[PDB]
Nucleic acid binder design. Structure first.
Ligand code: CA
Ligand code: ZN
Ligand code: ZN
Length: 59
DNA sequence: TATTGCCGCAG
DNA sequence: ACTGCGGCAAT
């Protein structure tokens, strides 16, 4: 139940370093991976990949 | 100590 | 529909 990782600007706590890494980068606006179709930026390639289905033609 | 893929939760 | 989020496992 321990959440020993925390943000130095707002104090939000995390179970492990990954949640903190992502949270810090979200404060920074660090979104280095982009959708090749529309240019929208995301934190990582997994998030880009999940976004791609926006560009399918809807049923 | 670090980063992301996968995954589920929630709005 | 779309995506912000974050725990876990792996690296
Ligand atoms: Ca969760
Ligand atoms: Zn914070
Ligand atoms: Zn796109």
């Amino acid at each position: 139940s321990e959440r020993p990782f925390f943000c130095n600007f707002c104090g939000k706590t995390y179970r492990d370093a990954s949640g903190l890494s992502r949270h810090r980068r979200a404060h920074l606006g660090y979104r280095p991976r982009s959708c090749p179709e529309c240019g929208k930026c995301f934190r990582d390639q997994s998030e880009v990949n999940r976004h791609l289905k926006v560009h399918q033609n809807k049923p």
